[PDB]
C-alpha cells in the first residue's frame, strides 16, 4: 500500500491503481499580512529619478 500526499495523475495511473479520491487538490498562496507602511522615501516619488 502507498499512502501520502500522492496526487492522482494519468502517468502514475499507468503503473499503479488508485482508489476514489477523498480530498480535493488545489493551488494556493501564502502571504504576510499587509504592511501598508509608506515607503521610507515616498516623499521622492512625485518625479522620476
Amino acid at each position: 500500500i502507498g499512502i501520502s500526499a500522492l496526487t492522482i495523475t494519468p502517468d502514475r495511473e499507468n503503473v499503479v491503481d488508485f482508489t476514489t479520491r477523498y480530498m480535493d487538490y488545489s493551488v494556493g498562496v501564502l502571504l504576510r499580512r499587509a504592511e501598508k507602511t509608506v515607503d521610507m522615501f515616498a516623499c521622492l516619488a512625485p518625479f522620476d529619478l
Partner: protein, 49 residues
C-alpha cells in the same frame, strides 16, 4: 489583445510627459537671446551707451 501599452506603473512624471514645460524656458532663452542681439546691433548706431 493590447488595449494600451501602459508601461508606467509609479505614475511619476518623466521627461517626455513633462516635455511641454521645458518649451516655455526654451522660448524664453531664444527670445532673450534675440533681444540681446537687437541691443548689440543697435549699439552700433546709438552713438552713446
Amino acid at each position: 489583445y493590447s488595449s494600451v501599452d501602459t508601461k508606467q506603473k509609479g505614475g511619476a512624471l518623466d521627461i517626455k510627459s513633462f516635455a511641454g514645460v521645458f518649451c516655455i524656458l526654451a522660448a524664453g532663452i531664444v527670445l532673450s537671446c534675440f533681444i540681446a542681439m537687437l541691443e548689440t546691433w543697435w549699439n552700433k548706431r546709438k552713438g552713446s551707451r
